[PDB]
């Protein structure tokens, strides 16, 4: 029993973190085989943050303008290139701790673990979601760029995020590991700001299923809803539309609990209209939307507490 | 900016997890140097869970009744002993990944990271607190026993918890790494149940300081309180008494924010009496008590967003 915001074990990623310095700027890089991946803004200077021309900045650099440190050991850079908003620094040493890995570009609503790092040294691990507005509600300070987000399947680390920017509302923007930003954001100092966000409906439903698995039914009701009628309510509460694909994805949780998806939708509809009336669900007084269906199956018992 | 439930990087602990089997029971062990530590209830059988005599059960076992598996490799047990509620299995191989470590017995209110494991394989990491009633609100299933809780300081892992039991309310009980239970609990099937719990006042105050550091002051007020008068209110709301030692521990956060501790106590008093009135603090609609003062300093900027 229990239900926590649960991150993946971070060891396989810890062994990949290094420090990258260019000029007076230091941040983190990800060392896989003989390449170190890092944010290209490591090459910027303070007077040229408004609209850096990265091609023009990078052509002025040599391999030896980049310092890479793995623990106490200097790795010599033997090549460099820019791919979108990341730099790939070829180094003279292949990382002996390189895990089996993939690069993935995730969809909004998916979750991942973040290994926050500073000066190439891991600091902490937490779970986040890609919000519908393509920001993440991370926890990051100066020097955290190049920290990565990931999921682990069997022994394979799927890297999905590299940290680049903090927006005016204190939320975060970054890229996939090929250097493409999530959302409309970019690596320049402009007026960019998070668009209006929405609540991830399919995730809220998954978490209500988690609560049932763990033995709590107080919020259920005798009603059902059509998908169309549910979505009319979702829209009023700034919830993402629920699609038939979401309904299909909730199939296994529905089967394990005996609660049809549209019946759980009727429960959620009532919770939105009535509030929780001072009660909690899985220790929260808010409807939680940063657990996917997969996250629930991963953490919960396969046997419902009936 | 941001503030998350942040666990320590788990890699140093991952490298210590093994599987221990005795009879038909399998659980996790912690392999440090040439010893594997695990819950002694690995030697129990289903018909003798109500009041096992562990001394009598263990004398009937040989070294070769214990199977220890590290990944795909069998470690041969060459000695065994019982210390309180843990078994120490001496093995023929010292763990080459043993980190610098200590065993610590923590005080109630302190937090730690849990590496949940099954069959010797790490599954996930989350943060918990030792509750005032010496339970932990963990997330654990069958096979999770022997999973450990820890903090990391510099390169040194301080192990503070090993998982043993789930109580009827779905919360958890376990031991220090010397096998002494936290709280009145034990490794037998009885009517033991969590005592009444309280909210960890010093931690709530620390988290209010975190909210100020991160730029939010909405909940402050112009009042102050004496410690005695605050504690009269704390008691009414089932909060732990605040001591002068707690006030001293909050010193650094008070200095960084310019908010005297007793003034933050007056803010908390008002929050308890008035509620949050539909607002949130650091994304929570409840007053959070599983961040210590140290946790706040560890995660937050040293510069307040004034
Ligand atoms: C990475 N090390 C750092 C992470 C930030 C620092 C505070 N919290 C974080 O998450 N990233 C930056 O400081 C970036 C780097 C950058 C590249 C090109 C141009 C300008 C910058 C400055 N950075 C910002 O995140 C700034 N934000 C923005 O400019 C914008 F809001 F995204 F538009 C700022 C946080 C104001 C320094
Ligand atoms: C460890 N692998 C397992 C972890 C449990 C299983 C469900 N969630 C958990 O956290 N621990 C047990 O199953 C223990 C072992 C044990 C030792 C001696 C005597 C009886 C047991 C059975 N266990 C329990 O946790 C049971 N709880 C209790 O007996 C009590 F509430 F603590 F009193 C029970 C969860 C009912 C199986």
Residue B224 in contact with partner chain A when CB distance is under 8 A: no
CATH number of residue B122's parent domain: 2.40.10.10
Does residue A226 sit within a domain? yes
Total structural domains within chain A? 2
Distance from Cα B283 to the centre of ligand 1, integer Å: 22
Host domain of residue A293: 201-299
- Ligand 1 atom with least separation from CA of A41: 17
Residue in A3, A5, A9, A115 to test binding to B, most B beta-carbons within 10 Å: A9
Answer for the pair A165, B26: CB distance below 8 angstroms, yes or no: no
All residues at 6 or more sequence positions from B225 whose CB lies less than 8 Å from its CB, including other chains: B233, B262, B265, B266, B269
- Any alpha helices (H) in chain B, and if so which ranges? 11-14, 54-59, 201-213, 227-236, 244-249, 251-257, 261-274, 293-299
Could you say which of A122, A170, A280 has the minimum Cβ distance to residue B1?
A: A170
At A20, is the secondary structure helix, strand, or coil?
strand
Query: Nearest CA to B267 among B215, B206, B214?
Result: B206
Q: State the sign of the Cα–Cα–Cα–Cα dihedral A129, A131, A134, A138.
A: negative
Say yes or no for a CB contact (<8 Å) between A11 and B8.
Answer: no
My answer on whether B77 and B154 are in the same domain is no
Answer yes or no: is A235 within a domain. yes
Distances (CA, A) of B110 to A6, A11, A188, B161, B200: 19, 24, 41, 12, 9
Q: Which residues contact B278 (CB under 8 A, 6 or more apart)?
A: none
> Could you report how far apart the first and last alpha carbons of chain B are, in Å?
13
- Among A33, A68, A91, the domain boundary falls at A91
Q: Which residues contact B212 (CB under 8 A, 6 or more apart)?
A: B220, B257, B259, B304
Q: Could you write out the DSSP letters of every residue in A154-179?
A: TTEEEEEEEEEEE-TTS-EEEE-TTS
Domain boundary among A57, A91, A125: A91
B85 to A80, A252, B122: CA distances (angstroms)? 56, 39, 22
Q: For B305, which residue in chain A has the nearest alpha carbon?
A: A170
- Name the domain boundary from B63, B91, B119: B91
Greatest CA separation for chain A: 69
Q: What's the longest Cα–Cα distance across chain B?
A: 69
- Residue B2 included in any domain: no
Same domain, B118 and B51: no
Is-contact B299 B6, C-beta < 8 A? yes
**Are the C-beta atoms of B3 and B299 separated by less than 8 Å?**
yes
B74 in Cβ contact with B18 (< 8 Å):
no
Answer whether A116 touches B (CB < 8 Å). yes
Residues contacting A10, CB < 8 A, separation 6+: A113, A115, A122, A125, B9, B10, B11, B125
Q: Within a domain: residue A96?
A: no
Please say whether the beta carbons of A206 and A129 come within 8 A: no
Q: Which of A3, A7, A297 to mutate to test the interface with B (most CBs of B within 10 A)?
A: A7
Which residue in A16, A41, A172, A265 is the catalytic one? A41
CA-nearest residue for atom 36, ligand 2, is: B166
Q: How far apart are CA B254 and CA A24, in angstroms?
A: 33
Q: How many CB atoms lie within 10 A of CB A49?
A: 13
Could you say which ligand is closest to the alpha carbon of residue B300?
Answer: 1
Is A293 inside a domain boundary? yes
Nearest CA in chain B to A275: B278
Is the domain of B75 the same as that of B105?
no
Question: Which of A5, A215, A285 is the closest to B126 by Cβ?
Answer: A5
- Assess whether B110 and B82 both reside in one domain: no
Q: How far apart are CA A166 and CA B301, in angstroms?
A: 14
d(CA B286, CA B300): 20
Question: CATH no. for residue A251?
Answer: 1.10.1840.10
Q: Are residues B85 and B124 in the same domain?
A: no
**∠ CA A298-B290-A166 to the nearest 5 degrees?**
75
Report the C-alpha gap between A128 and A227 in whole angstroms: 28
Q: Is the CB of A260 under 6 A from ligand 1?
A: no
Q: Find the Cα–Cα–Cα–Cα dihedral B44, B47, B50, B55, rounded to 10°.
A: -40
A297: three-class secondary structure by DSSP:
helix
- φ, ψ for residue B41, nearest 5 deg: -70, -5
- Considering only the beta carbons, identify the residue of A139, A285, A299 that sits closest to B3: A139
CA distance B265 to B25: 50
Answer yes or no: is A2 within a domain.
Answer: no
CA of A11: which chain B residue's CA is closest?
Answer: B11
Distance from CA of B39 to the nearest CA of A (A): 19
Report the structure determination method: X-ray
């Amino acid at each position: 029993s229990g239900f926590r915001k649960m991150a993946f074990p971070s060891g396989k990623v810890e062994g990949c973190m290094v420090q990258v310095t260019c000029g007076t700027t230091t941040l983190n890089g990800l060392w896989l085989d003989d390449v170190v991946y890092c944010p290209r803004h490591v090459i910027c200077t303070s007077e040229d943050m408004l609209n850096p021309n990265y091609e023009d900045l990078l052509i002025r650099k040599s391999n030896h303008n980049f310092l890479v440190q793995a623990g106490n050991v200097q790795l010599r850079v033997i090549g460099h290139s820019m791919q979108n908003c990341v730099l790939k620094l070829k180094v003279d040493t292949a990382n002996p701790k390189t895990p089996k890995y993939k690069f993935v570009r995730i969809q909004p609503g998916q979750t991942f673990s973040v290994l926050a790092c500073y000066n190439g040294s891991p600091s902490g691990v937490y779970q986040c979601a890609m919000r519908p507005n393509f920001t993440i509600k991370g926890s990051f300070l100066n020097g955290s760029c190049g920290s990565v987000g990931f999921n682990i399947d069997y022994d394979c680390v799927s890297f999905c995020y590299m940290h680049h920017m903090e927006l005016p509302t204190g939320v975060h923007a970054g890229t996939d590991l090929e250097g493409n930003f999530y959302g409309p954001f970019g690596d320049r100092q402009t007026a960019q700001a998070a668009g209006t966000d929405t609540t991830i409906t399919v995730n809220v439903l998954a978490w209500l299923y988690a609560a049932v698995i763990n033995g709590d039914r107080w919020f259920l009701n005798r009603f059902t809803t059509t998908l169309n009628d549910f979505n009319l309510v979702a829209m009023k509460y700034n919830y993402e539309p629920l699609t038939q694909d979401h309904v299909d994805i909730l199939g296994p949780l529905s089967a394990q609990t005996g609660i049809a998806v549209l019946d759980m939708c009727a429960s959620l509809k009532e919770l939105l209209q009535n509030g929780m009336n001072g009660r909690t669900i899985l220790g929260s007084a808010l409807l939680e939307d940063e657990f996917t269906p997969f996250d629930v199956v991963r953490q919960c018992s396969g046997v419902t507490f009936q």
